[PDB]
Design a protein around this nucleic acid. Structure first.
Lengths: 74, 82, 79, 83, 86, 97, 74
RNA sequence: GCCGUGACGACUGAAAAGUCGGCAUUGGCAAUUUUUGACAGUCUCUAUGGGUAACCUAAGGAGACUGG
């Protein structure tokens, strides 16, 4: 207990992140903690309009992470 | 102090419970546990915007409770003693 | 590997202006300079602003402590 | 550790269906299931709330944001009939 | 005291109500601390729980099968029918 | 712990139980419960007496054409238990007076 | 400032005029009497601002921690 | 109900420490994956429903928006 999420496999891979609020971003996994809070580099916001905007390196709180999908092969 | 202990004493009382989802539950308490999970018998349960349904038994996850309406008769000062 | 908490510690040290995505509220986001933070990701922000994405309007706040409950996402802004 | 959790770990390597808190439906092979219900899957078919389908190679869903899972019936027989 | 209130209904057919308002009916085979539930031969209903609705009893019924439901999303449970013997 | 109930924000509840004074509880259900605190705990579960519950409603399109006017409502509840998560705000006042 | 944390900030703000925004968009202005470990909050001479406009003058008030979005000194 | 803690004991380890059984209670269980809530509220669409037409209705099913 106080377990890690099993995410080493996904380290330094490009990912597609579905967040709550119908929000979606894409970026490279740079790290994580036991709460599933993530560090995502070269992150891009995929606006509901279809337009995408570069936001750089960011922190996503694991709380609000619905789902992730790898855009690479692990 | 721990008020769930108080609720655990209310076996065989009849109560009305209002749920977080608006549902109204009237029945006789068979058991409250430490998580406030509540079990009843002879239950008339009215989901918001339905006519009641009667169930011989119903088991509620504690967190889904808004509040209990207790018997007017209930001797609270007795029950609050430990 | 970069740990998320450390990124924040970096934000703190840098005094980079930060934009926070809130939980289940898209029309408003919060901005400010992280002065300090705690184990619950509660943040102390300086010269903070409410940002209305719909109205293009900003509300001026000053000294803010934002509960971490609301944090969806943490980003940096050049401004 | 919970009885249902042991049965979930038993389904690792099997095809399972997962519905999220938002009602998206993911069907494919369960690679890894963590204690907190965090789920790694592969070769997915996803069916959105509008009905449309898509295909994904690799996914990972947080346990909290799962509403439920459907497991094979291959599991129903044993050994957990003791409880 | 007894802990039995769940263990009593084990092996029975059970009507479980979800937080969105769905109705899951299956054979109650296991539970835990969180009230994560194991439901064998489980179907989902949406429109009604029949009390002999003269028009029909069953609309939007779906066969699911072996279901594990997370307790977070459970609201309540009542006894639907006795255990199947099998 | 008692010290934290006594001097912390929950002293509002501690003070209401000791003085048998009224408090209004703004509640998640959009309802307000007005009454006396017989007991309370960390979570703000409470056992309440002489509760006046107040809320507001609409006829909700009684016409059939989306026409209604807001309506206040109330009801008396002598004895009841409130699960504390539903608490938004708890108000102490010159209410009891 | 050299690291100014949540807890001390709030403690410095006790004895002061504050306004708290709640997640639900209500706002409450008053003197912060105290806060506790869970970040429950006690105001005196509270006022309510809804839609940013003075609604009700309320007096002494407890706010449950989970409701709080943010607190501002003012 | 869940998990700690203190000794006693047993079994391993080079060590640091690790594992197991029974006993005991001076301990806790609202801060991201479950049980002390992010929920609350609004509006449009649909007859497999009724109606003589005109049309009225929306349980169920679908979508949009607010929380300044």
């Amino acid at each position: 207990k106080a377990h890690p999420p099993e995410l080493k496999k996904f380290m330094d891979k490009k990912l597609s992140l579905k967040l709550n609020g119908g929000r979606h971003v894409q970026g490279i996994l740079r790290g994580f903690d036991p709460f599933m809070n993530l560090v995502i580099d070269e992150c891009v916001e995929m606006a509901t309009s279809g337009q995408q905007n570069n936001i750089g390196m960011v922190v996503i709180r694991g709380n609000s992470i619905i789902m992730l999908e790898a855009l690479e092969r692990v | 102090m721990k008020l769930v202990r108080f609720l655990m004493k209310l076996s065989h009382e009849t109560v009305t419970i209002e749920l977080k989802n608006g549902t109204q539950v009237h029945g006789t308490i068979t058991g409250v546990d430490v998580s406030m999970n509540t079990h009843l018998k002879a239950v008339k349960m009215t989901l918001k915007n339905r006519e009641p349904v009667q169930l011989e038994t119903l088991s509620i996850r504690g967190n889904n409770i808004r509040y209990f309406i207790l018997p007017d008769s209930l001797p609270l000062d007795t029950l609050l003693v430990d | 590997m970069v740990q998320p908490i450390n990124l924040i510690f970096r934000y703190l040290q840098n005094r980079s202006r930060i934009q926070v995505w809130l939980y289940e509220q898209v029309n408003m986001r919060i901005e400010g300079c992280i002065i300090g933070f705690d184990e619950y990701m509660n943040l102390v922000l300086d010269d903070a602003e409410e940002i209305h994405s719909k109205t293009k309007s900003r509300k001026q706040l000053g000294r803010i402590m934002l509960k971490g409950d609301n944090i969806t996402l943490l980003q940096s802004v050049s401004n | 550790i919970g009885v249902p959790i042991k049965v979930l770990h038993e389904a690792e390597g099997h095809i399972v269906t997962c519905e999220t808190n938002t009602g998206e439906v993911y069907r494919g092979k369960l690679i890894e299931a963590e204690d907190n219900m965090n789920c790694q899957m592969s070769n997915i078919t996803v069916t959105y709330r509008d009905g449309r389908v898509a295909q994904l190679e690799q996914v990972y869903i947080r346990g909290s944001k799962i509403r439920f899972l459907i497991l094979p019936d291959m599991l129903k027989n044993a050994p957990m009939l003791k409880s | 005291g007894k802990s039995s209130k769940m263990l009593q209904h084990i092996d029975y057919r059970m009507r479980c109500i979800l937080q969105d308002g769905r109705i899951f009916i299956g054979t109650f085979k296991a539970f835990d601390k969180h009230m994560n539930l194991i439901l064998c031969d489980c179907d989902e209903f949406r429109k009604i729980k029949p009390k002999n609705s003269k028009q029909a009893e069953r609309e939007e019924k779906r066969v699911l099968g072996l279901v594990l439901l997370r307790g977070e999303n459970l609201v309540s449970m009542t006894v639907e029918g006795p255990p199947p013997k099998d | 712990e008692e010290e934290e109930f006594n001097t912390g924000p929950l002293s509002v509840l501690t003070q209401s139980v000791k003085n048998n004074t009224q408090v209004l509880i703004n509640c998640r259900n959009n309802k307000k419960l007005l009454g006396r605190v017989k007991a309370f705990d960390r979570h703000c579960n409470m056992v309440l007496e002489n509760v006046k519950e107040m809320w507001t409603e609409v006829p909700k399109s009684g016409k059939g054409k989306k026409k209604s006017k807001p309506v206040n409502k109330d009801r008396y509840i002598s004895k009841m238990f409130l699960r504390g998560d539903s608490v938004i705000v708890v108000l102490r006042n010159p209410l009891i007076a | 400032s050299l690291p100014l944390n949540p807890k001390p900030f709030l403690n410095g703000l006790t004895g002061k005029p504050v306004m708290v925004k709640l997640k639900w968009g209500m706002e409450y202005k008053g003197y912060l009497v105290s806060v506790d470990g869970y970040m429950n909050m006690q105001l005196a001479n509270t006022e309510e601002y809804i839609d940013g406009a003075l609604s009700g003058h309320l007096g002494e008030v407890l706010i449950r921690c989970n409701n709080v979005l943010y607190i501002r000194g003012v």
